[PDB]
Design a protein around this ligand. Structure first.
Ligand code: ATP
Ligand code: A1BLR
Length: 818
């Protein structure tokens, strides 16, 4: 008769027109979902809400599963609700999906046994919708699974009895697993929202997902929020300015939830005729401020309130009934008070439960429970469950304990916490950090950036400085401004760190990290800085070099691998080399520092007081043209001993240039990395000359070249020289065969300095190895790995090599492949 899908769209539009779908909105004002402030969405590249499920750029491969990850408060629910409304309004997926089914994971039970009847309860009031009709057909239906991490109770990601078929009733965990794994109603689309931490389990269900990260408000979007929140423009501007002046809070406000909390606080202060001051610095300070302002205008119910929250965390319960409120001393009068002020919500769409306005608030109270003046009240058992899904990870519960357990405390509710307990907890928290600071990642989590968000929450230097004494090595990945703010605070107070590794994720290409590099330059203990494999391009190097010229820098080793640097950055690197007398090791591998960049770099390398000892220029798009400048550096440098230039186009002519100066007996070169440089036997006479004259050269790496047997003979003329002191010779993958074995054998029985000789991916043959075995027994000085890896031989040869290892144990390592 009529198309029932129209009624469903009408239902969705009337239901999702508001932000919460719940009452107690500070007098239940209309929240107006049209206020939605745009969130930043990055595909793992910026994307639009439309075309989200389109096939990718090759093979036209379709996507069924899309996962949206983000922090608590970033807007995963407001965004998923927005999609429901936009679709129902005909502004999104108009010709892609016939239905959108919104699944609220805080309502789904992992214990209760049910068929796929959620499709009934999640839609119109009609108790008997046409489930068996065309709505049963996949490819036109998208499910929105909102809050994977909010599922209450243990969840097993590995299930034997997957139980497909929507008609069969089964446990919620099994049912969700089959839906996520696309075994139940396959070829349907599924969108999942989750906190990044819960991906530890979800990753096993998804198989081949598309991932999108949700980022909060840009500075422009923060302003829009305030202007939309406050209908009075004069107030909106005053509020914005007050916050803008608070750099720390402004930074935190990238999270929509933080903006909401702050705005609500200011609104209440306006109504009461207060100063409107907002001086919060930490997440805890913001939450305490908010709750205090609401409780001030009652406060004797804090115990029951906190106890309720704590129970919910331990028993995995978010939704409460009147019985649960009464069981904790909450009954009607105070409950209503907590609806007038926005602490609880009841739900308005023909439902009656109670819950906290946000999971972070429930966790806040659950944390405060431990400090007041009944699951445990033992912080030890709490911490033991930190990394577990089963308890909701307790990330904010612990993070808030750090903030609450602080000597720098004030009045209003906070004063009701016990000082004796606070000290007991404080000490346990220090022990917890010491233990977690020394651990393997293993996807478990108090991840160093996380221990730093914990430390940031308490500004007490006496605590933080001691906590930071457990981090001799810091490895972190920063994606947002808040990550930098937190990292800088902790590093500024760390006097033990010797090695620091900083990753940068899509927000370098800019100066975002300037406020962190300015910290590193004042560190006295830091000696090694690793900034590899991140987009620290030219402008980023300029900032770093500015800080490396600081008189107290003390950085000795700097690793700059795939940083996206070009020749211009060498100008600034040179300036550092000409001033900073402490820098010893510099790795510039895998950059675009072509011949010109080296010419510039060499200006610093040839400078008096440049003490650089080790330089890596591997895969830097170099060719023979630059060898003239490198040769000049080798000729005069008093400190450069290690030079690695492989994986470049330094052909025979380039090597001959370097050799012309390297052969000088006064040259300090000790290790030469002429690896995958396209050398042939033509240049071996040059290398031979160097070996014969330069007694300081101890390591030569020629693997990947094509020297052949002729090259070996030429090198042997030098290697067999009485004044040659080479200790390590690597000739892997040099296109050598059995015809060179006579000369290699001669080397083994004549060289006095050789200790390690490495042959590898080449057709040495069985005759070759057997001949070596027969001479390696005759008081050979060779002690180290003989190589012969990635080589295959007959049974006799394998036995002979094993025999040699037992008979002549001085040659400890042969390293056969089998
Ligand atoms: N785009 C937006 N515009 C304005 N406010 C927003 C937006 N996104 C989120 N908020 C604010 O954030 C608060 C809660 O955020 P939200 O509940 O979406 O966080 P979440 O952790 O993603 O949710 P859930 O835990 O339910 O998945 C709301 O009170 C709302 O005011
Ligand atoms: C688990 N941990 C690993 C290391 C990186 C860290 N990243 C974030 C991102 C965001 C927030 C965050 C902080 C305060 C708030 C509040 F104020 F709204 F409560 C809401 C948040 O979402 N906290 N940590 C997560």
């Amino acid at each position: 008769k009529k198309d029932y899908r129209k009624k469903y769209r009408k239902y969705v539009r009337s239901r999702f027109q508001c932000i919460e779908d719940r009452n107690a909105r500070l007098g239940e004002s209309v929240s107006l979902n049209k206020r939605y402030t745009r969130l930043r969405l990055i595909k793992e590249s910026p994307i639009k809400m439309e075309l989200l499920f389109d096939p990718d750029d090759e093979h036209s491969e379709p996507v069924h599963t899309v996962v949206f990850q983000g922090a608590a408060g970033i807007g995963k629910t407001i965004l998923a609700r927005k999609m429901m409304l936009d679709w129902a309004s005909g502004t999104l997926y108009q010709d892609r999906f016939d239905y959108l089914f919104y699944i609220h994971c805080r309502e789904v039970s992992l214990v209760t046994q049910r068929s796929l009847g959620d499709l009934i309860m999640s839609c119109c009031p009609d108790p008997n919708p046409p489930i068996h009709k065309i709505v049963r057909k996949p490819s036109r239906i998208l499910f929105l699974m909102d809050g994977f991490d909010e599922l209450q109770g243990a969840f097993d990601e590995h299930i034997g009895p997957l139980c497909t078929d929507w008609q069969k009733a089964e446990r919620g965990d099994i049912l969700l697993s089959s839906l996520i794994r696309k075994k139940l109603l396959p070829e349907a689309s599924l969108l999942i929202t989750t906190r990044p931490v819960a991906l530890e389990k979800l990753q096993h269900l998804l198989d081949h997902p598309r991932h999108v990260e949700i980022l909060g408000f840009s500075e422009a979007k923060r302003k829009e929020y305030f202007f939309k929140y406050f209908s009075d423009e004069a107030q909106a501007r005053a509020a914005f300015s007050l916050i803008q002046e608070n750099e720390v809070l402004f930074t935190m406000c990238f999270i929509p939830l933080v903006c909401w909390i702050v705005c609500t606080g200011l609104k209440q202060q306006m109504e009461s005729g207060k100063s409107l001051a907002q001086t919060s610095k930490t997440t805890t300070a913001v939450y305490v401020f908010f709750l205090s302002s609401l409780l001030q205008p009652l406060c004797a119910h804090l115990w029951g309130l906190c106890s309720l929250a704590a129970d919910g965390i331990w028993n995995q319960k978010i939704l409460f009934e009147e019985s649960d409120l009464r069981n904790h001393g909450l009954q009607k009068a105070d409950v209503s008070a907590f609806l007038r002020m926005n602490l609880f919500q009841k739900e308005v769409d023909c439902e009656k439960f109670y819950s906290f306005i946000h999971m972070t608030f429930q966790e806040f109270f659950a944390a405060m429970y431990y400090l007041l003046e009944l699951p445990s009240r033992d912080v030890t058992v709490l911490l033991e469950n930190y990394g577990k899904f089963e308890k909701g990870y307790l990330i904010f519960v612990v993070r808030f304990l750090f903030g609450l357990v602080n000597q720098e405390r004030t009045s209003y509710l906070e004063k009701k916490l016990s000082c004796k307990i606070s000290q007991q907890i404080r000490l346990e928290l220090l022990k917890w950090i010491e233990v977690k600071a020394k651990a393997k990642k293993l996807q478990i989590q108090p991840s160093q950036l996380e221990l730093f968000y914990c430390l940031y929450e308490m500004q007490e230097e006496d605590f933080v400085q001691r906590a930071m004494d457990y981090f001799p090595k810091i490895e972190i990945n920063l994606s947002t401004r808040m990550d930098h703010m937190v990292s800088s605070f902790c590093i500024e107070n760390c006097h033990r760190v010797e090695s620091l590794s900083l990753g940068f994720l899509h927000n370098l290409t800019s100066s975002f990290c300037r406020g962190l590099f300015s910290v590193l330059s004042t560190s006295q203990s830091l000696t090694e800085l690793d900034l590899s494999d991140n987009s620290l391009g030219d402008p980023g190097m300029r900032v770093l070099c500015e800080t490396l010229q600081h008189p107290g820098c003390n950085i000795r080793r700097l690793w700059l691998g795939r940083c996206g640097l070009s020749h211009e950055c060498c100008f600034d690197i040179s300036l550092v080399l000409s001033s900073n007398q402490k820098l010893v090791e510099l790795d510039l591998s895998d950059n675009a520092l072509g011949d010109f960049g080296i010419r510039l770099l060499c200006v610093g390398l040839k400078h008096l007081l440049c003490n650089l000892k080790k330089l890596w220029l591997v895969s830097c798009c170099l060719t023979s043209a630059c060898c003239q400048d490198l040769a000049s550096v080798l000729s005069t440098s008093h400190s450069l001993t290690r030079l690695y230039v492989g994986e470049n186009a330094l052909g025979d002519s380039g090597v001959a240039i370097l050799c012309e100066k390297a052969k000088n007996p006064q040259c300090n070169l000790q290790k030469l990395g002429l690896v995958n440089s396209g050398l042939t036997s033509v240049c071996c006479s040059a290398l031979s000359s160097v070996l014969s004259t330069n007694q300081n050269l101890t390591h030569l790496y020629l693997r990947g070249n094509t020297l052949g047997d002729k090259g070996i003979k030429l090198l042997c003329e030098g290697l067999l020289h009485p004044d040659c002191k080479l200790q390590v010779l690597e000739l892997d993958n040099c296109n050598l065969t059995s015809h060179c074995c006579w000369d290699l054998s001669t080397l083994l029985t004549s060289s006095q300095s050789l200790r390690k000789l490495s042959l590898g991916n080449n057709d040495l043959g069985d005759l070759g190895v057997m001949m070596f075995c027969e001479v390696l027994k005759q008081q050979s000085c060779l002690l180290q790995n003989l190589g012969l890896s990635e080589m295959y031989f007959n049974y006799e040869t394998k036995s002979a090599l094993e025999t040699l290892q037992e008979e002549k144990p001085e040659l400890t390592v042969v390293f056969e492949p089998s």
